[PDB]
Amino acid sequence: RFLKVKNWETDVVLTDTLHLKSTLETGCTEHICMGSIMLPRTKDQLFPLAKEFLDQYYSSIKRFGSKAHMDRLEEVNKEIESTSTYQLKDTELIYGAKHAWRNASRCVGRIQWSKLQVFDARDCTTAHGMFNYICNHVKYATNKGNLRSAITIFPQRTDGKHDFRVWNSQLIRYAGYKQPDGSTLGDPANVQFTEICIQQGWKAPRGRFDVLPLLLQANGNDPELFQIPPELVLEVPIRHPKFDWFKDLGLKWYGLPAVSNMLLEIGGLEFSACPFSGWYMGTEIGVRDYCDNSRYNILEEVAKKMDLDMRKTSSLWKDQALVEINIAVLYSFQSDKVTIVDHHSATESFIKHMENEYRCRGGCPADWVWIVPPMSGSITPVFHQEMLNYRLTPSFEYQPDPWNTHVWK
Amino acid sequence: RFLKVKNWETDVVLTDTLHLKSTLETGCTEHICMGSIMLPTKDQLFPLAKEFLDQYYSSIKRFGSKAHMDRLEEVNKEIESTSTYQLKDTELIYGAKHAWRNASRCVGRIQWSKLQVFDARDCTTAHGMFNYICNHVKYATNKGNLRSAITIFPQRTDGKHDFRVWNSQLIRYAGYKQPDGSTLGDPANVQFTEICIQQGWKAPRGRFDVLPLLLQANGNDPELFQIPPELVLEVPIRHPKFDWFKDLGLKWYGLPAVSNMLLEIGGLEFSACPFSGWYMGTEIGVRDYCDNSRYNILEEVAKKMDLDMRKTSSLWKDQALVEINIAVLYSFQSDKVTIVDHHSATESFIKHMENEYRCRGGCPADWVWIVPPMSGSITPVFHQEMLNYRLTPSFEYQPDPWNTHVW
Numbered sequence: 001r002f003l004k005v006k007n008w009e010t011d012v013v014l015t016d017t018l019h020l021k022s023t024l025e026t027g028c029t030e031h032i033c034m035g036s037i038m039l040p041r042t043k044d045q046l047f048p049l050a051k052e053f054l055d056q057y058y059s060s061i062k063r064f065g066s067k068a069h070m071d072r073l074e075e076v077n078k079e080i081e082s083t084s085t086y087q088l089k090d091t092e093l094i095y096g097a098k099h100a101w102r103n104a105s106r107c108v109g110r111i112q113w114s115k116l117q118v119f120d121a122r123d124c125t126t127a128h129g130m131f132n133y134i135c136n137h138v139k140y141a142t143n144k145g146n147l148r149s150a151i152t153i154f155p156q157r158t159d160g161k162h163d164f165r166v167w168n169s170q171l172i173r174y175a176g177y178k179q180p181d182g183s184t185l186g187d188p189a190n191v192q193f194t195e196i197c198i199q200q201g202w203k204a205p206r207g208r209f210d211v212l213p214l215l216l217q218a219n220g221n222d223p224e225l226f227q228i229p230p231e232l233v234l235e236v237p238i239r240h241p242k243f244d245w246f247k248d249l250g251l252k253w254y255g256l257p258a259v260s261n262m263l264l265e266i267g268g269l270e271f272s273a274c275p276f277s278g279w280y281m282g283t284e285i286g287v288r289d290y291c292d293n294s295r296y297n298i299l300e301e302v303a304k305k306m307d308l309d310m311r312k313t314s315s316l317w318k319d320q321a322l323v324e325i326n327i328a329v330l331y332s333f334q335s336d337k338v339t340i341v342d343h344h345s346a347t348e349s350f351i352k353h354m355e356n357e358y359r360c361r362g363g364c365p366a367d368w369v370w371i372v373p374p375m376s377g378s379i380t381p382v383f384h385q386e387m388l389n390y391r392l393t394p395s396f397e398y399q400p401d402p403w404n405t406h407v408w409k
Numbered sequence: 410r411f412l413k414v415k416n417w418e419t420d421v422v423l424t425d426t427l428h429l430k431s432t433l434e435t436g437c438t439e440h441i442c443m444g445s446i447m448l449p450t451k452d453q454l455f456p457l458a459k460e461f462l463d464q465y466y467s468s469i470k471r472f473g474s475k476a477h478m479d480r481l482e483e484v485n486k487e488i489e490s491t492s493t494y495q496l497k498d499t500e501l502i503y504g505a506k507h508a509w510r511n512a513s514r515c516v517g518r519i520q521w522s523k524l525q526v527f528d529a530r531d532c533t534t535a536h537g538m539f540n541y542i543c544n545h546v547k548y549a550t551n552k553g554n555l556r557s558a559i560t561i562f563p564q565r566t567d568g569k570h571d572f573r574v575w576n577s578q579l580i581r582y583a584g585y586k587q588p589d590g591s592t593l594g595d596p597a598n599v600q601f602t603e604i605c606i607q608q609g610w611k612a613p614r615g616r617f618d619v620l621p622l623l624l625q626a627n628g629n630d631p632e633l634f635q636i637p638p639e640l641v642l643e644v645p646i647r648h649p650k651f652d653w654f655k656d657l658g659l660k661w662y663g664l665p666a667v668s669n670m671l672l673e674i675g676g677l678e679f680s681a682c683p684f685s686g687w688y689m690g691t692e693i694g695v696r697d698y699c700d701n702s703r704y705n706i707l708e709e710v711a712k713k714m715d716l717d718m719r720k721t722s723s724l725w726k727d728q729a730l731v732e733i734n735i736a737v738l739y740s741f742q743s744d745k746v747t748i749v750d751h752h753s754a755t756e757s758f759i760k761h762m763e764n765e766y767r768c769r770g771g772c773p774a775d776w777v778w779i780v781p782p783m784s785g786s787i788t789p790v791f792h793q794e795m796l797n798y799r800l801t802p803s804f805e806y807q808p809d810p811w812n813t814h815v816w
């Protein structure tokens with residue numbers, strides 16, 4: 001079955017066949033679309049998942065059906081029946097990690113998928129060990145501002161009782177503290193985690209931009225706290241090109257975005273601790289982190305300084321202030337020489353990547369709801385692009401926050 | 410099953426049961442989501458009619474009454490005899506209002522119950538259609554104080570006597586292909602603008618020429634008509650700060666009025682059912698004015714603002730976008746023509762959603778279409794999870810007539 005996708009701004013039509021290889025469910029039914037919903041083993045099911053993966057791997061290197069291909073399948077089968085699981089070769093791990101990124105339908109930066117530094121941390125055994133691995137990842141990825149995509153992969157899940165987990169949602173993130181008056185100091189998004197850190201012993205400096213400590217869980221044991229070496233945490237003071245009063249807002253952000261709470265599934269194997277990092281698209285900070293009502297919420301303060309007509313929404317003061325803030329984020333990062341991409345460039349690149357993928361791969365799963373930027377949506381090419389969302393493995397998946405499932409010792 | 414929807418900004422959770430009454434398909438499957446795709450017999454009729462009549466009588470608190478039963482029997486006998494049936498005026502009004510209520514892509518449904526319905530089922534000719542349409546335009550325009558309305562022409566019979574309004578909207582600007590290879594006016598109407606010429610219209614070759622109505626009655630060939638200029642309310646666009654804006658020479662019409670859709674009620678199909686409301690600022694300022702395939706005016710406006718268009722990261726397109734939309738709203742409001750900004754419209758929709766969920770058990774909504782084309786996340790709907798599904802009565806898309814008409 002072939003599926004057509006049209007770009008209503010260029011009339012360019014593409015054909016998707018890749019979806020024929022999607023195995024997982026999407027959440028939608030022939031009677032209801034849950035496209036905007038944020039989030040809708042056993043010896044038996046493992047080998048098939050292993051085989052599917054290995055066939056994909058060997059096909060990619062043009063060795064499908066080869067003796068090397070058949071021995072690997074036999075080797076893995078034996079291993080699974082013998083140990084109930086199996087270990088991936090280094091090459092398969094790298095291939096797996098890259099494709100999980102390549103298959104992430106909500107990622108607009110996938111044009112960079114083939115360029116990913118994979119750090120094999122499967123020999124790690126303790127939380128201190130995890131900390132060392134993570135520091136090395138942050139330093140390598142940061143590269144003094146010239147950001148490089150990378151991922152660190154800790155030991156896969158076994159009985160589900162010895163999981164490795166990074167309790168932080170991002171390796172680097174600011175603390176949030178709820179005040180008794182109901183207000184919040186810092187980043188609202190991280191209040192609950194900040195509370196856990198404090199409870200675990202963290203001495204919170206209680207400021208507006210406190211880099212959180214790492215809470216690391218190794219081999220199913222209780223998590224431990226670690227402070228990332230300040231010299232390893234690159235930050236950018238936010239100022240505006242024309243508004244000299246902007247800097248006085250006291251804003252800044254970290255340069256390295258590093259998601260650390262997702263699960264990496266490769267050939268049936270589950271890697272519960274797999275922090276990965278890339279670089280920021282300006283709107284993530286400028287629009288969401290700074291202007292979401294439930295985040296820093298700086299629109300008013302910025303608006304006032306600009307002396308905009310805040311009496312009636314129709315003046316579009318919120319929109320005006322929104323643009324200036326995003327100009328400030330991009331300007332500051334560029335001036336400090338810290339990698340970043342604006343939404344115009346990022347979306348234009350995604351379209352080229354997406355078209356390339358259709359011709360070489362026969363498809364490119366994409367989540368329109370997530371691909372389209374949170375500002376100036378229709379002036380970016382993705383808004384006008386029809387997309388097809390479906391799930392391919394390997395892949396990155398969500399998993400419940402560890403504090404909701406961890407059995408304390 | 411009972412599905413839940415959460416707003417990630419207020420944490421409010423709503424439970425949806427209304428979806429369990431969905432009938433048509435969505436185009437999606439367990440393996441693939443097509444949420445962003447623009448467009449994914451007597452034995453057949455009575456079931457549909459029954460479904461409709463049941464909801465109608467239920468809405469008037471007479472479910473299972475004799476009147477309910479009698480009506481169901483009358484229609485049943487009418488279908489078996491005439492292979493179709495006619496709706497009572499009350500059922501027609503209820504149907505139209507509910508087709509609007511069920512339009513998952515409409516952000517202004519909080520206004521659903523306030524719809525003036527004009528019964529034009531007694532119409533027989535294109536001239537009659539013109540008369541009905543002018544009356545509709547005049548009533549809805551209300552000198553700038555816009556009022557929602559729909560005019561319903563005769564329902565489809567054998568498919569060979571369908572009434573159709575060939576225009577996509579009652580009021581729209583023409584588009585012509587020039588020698589340069591460029592396009593003059595609105596590129597979106599190039600094809601229609603040609604069929605008008607190919608039919609007789611004498612195009613003024615302007616940047617904003619109000620297109621002539623092309624009306625089709627009883628399957629006959631469409632006829633042209635010029636909407637009395639005095640009935641077409643237009644707004645010149647100026648900025649409340651950049652006095653150079655007026656020089657762009659831009660203007661837009663105040664009455665948005667979709668005319669190419671199909672209204673389906675109790676199985677019956679109304680191929681010509683033009684309806685109107687009022688504009689949300691972004692529709693004109695973001696989409697019609699800035700879309701690359703439309704008037705595509707960003708660069709021009711950018712220049713006059715003298716901003717660095719050298720690098721995309723200066724966000725000149727974004728800065729220029731806001732101002733263009735500030736102007737549209739400013740103009741309309743100055744001329745006292747009804748119009749709503751995306752902030753206000755989305756806030757209303759959220760309220761409507763909450764009302765619908767507690768009174769109806771849900772509200773089908775298409776997130777992709779509900780979220781404005783600019784400043785998406787600073788509007789509440791962005792943070793609102795939505796469930797999309799099809800309910801009848803409904804407004805459906807239909808093939809352009811020029812691709813199906815047998816001259």
Ligand code: HEM
Pocket residue numbers: 097101104106107108109110112116149150151276277278279280281284341346370396
């Ligand atoms: C080169 C820099 C990259 C850019 C500019 C980029 C940009 C983005 C953005 C803007 C999002 C949506 C984020 C949000 O709204 O919170 C996203 C999501 C995602 N990206 Fe990328 N990305 C990059 C690199 C990567 C890398 C290296 C990986 C994996 C190895 C990756 C995996 C994903 C995944 C799995 C998601 C969805 C996660 C979720 O659902 O929250 N991205 N990316």
Ligand code: HEM
Pocket residue numbers: 509512514515516517518520524557558559684685686687688689692749754778804
């Ligand atoms: C009172 C003011 C109203 C507002 C502000 C409003 C606004 C909107 C907007 C912004 C859209 C999407 C427009 C686009 O992007 O092309 C829309 C779509 C829609 N509206 Fe409303 N609407 C209003 C009244 C009405 C009325 C009176 C009806 C029906 C009688 C209605 C039926 C629909 C339908 C069926 C769609 C989807 C059409 C499509 O698929 O292209 N709307 N509305």
Ligand SMILES: C[C@H](O)[C@H](O)[C@H]1CNc2nc(N)[nH]c(=O)c2N1
Pocket residue numbers: 036037038369370371417791792793794795
């Ligand atoms: C409810 C809705 O799904 C939610 O607000 C989504 C919309 N699109 C998004 N897109 C991106 N990139 N990131 C997000 O967090 C979201 N949130």
Ligand SMILES: C[C@H](O)[C@H](O)[C@H]1CNc2nc(N)[nH]c(=O)c2N1
Pocket residue numbers: 008383384385386387444445446447777778779
């Ligand atoms: C491809 C994509 O479906 C298309 O560009 C949609 C997106 N959302 C939209 N939303 C509204 N209101 N109107 C539109 O025309 C569109 N176009």
Ligand SMILES: CCCNC(=[NH2+])NCCC[C@H](N)C(=O)O
Pocket residue numbers: 257258259276277278279280281284285288289
């Ligand atoms: C970790 C891979 C890079 N992905 C990315 N750019 N963004 C996703 C996480 C960043 C998050 N939106 C934030 O503002 O903090």
Ligand SMILES: CCCNC(=[NH2+])NCCC[C@H](N)C(=O)O
Pocket residue numbers: 665666667684685686687688689692693696697
């Ligand atoms: C016809 C009812 C009102 N519907 C509405 N506001 N918009 C839909 C059609 C208008 C179209 N988006 C435009 O900019 O021209």
Ligand SMILES: [Zn+2]
Pocket residue numbers: 028032033034035437438441442443444
């Ligand atoms: Zn779907």
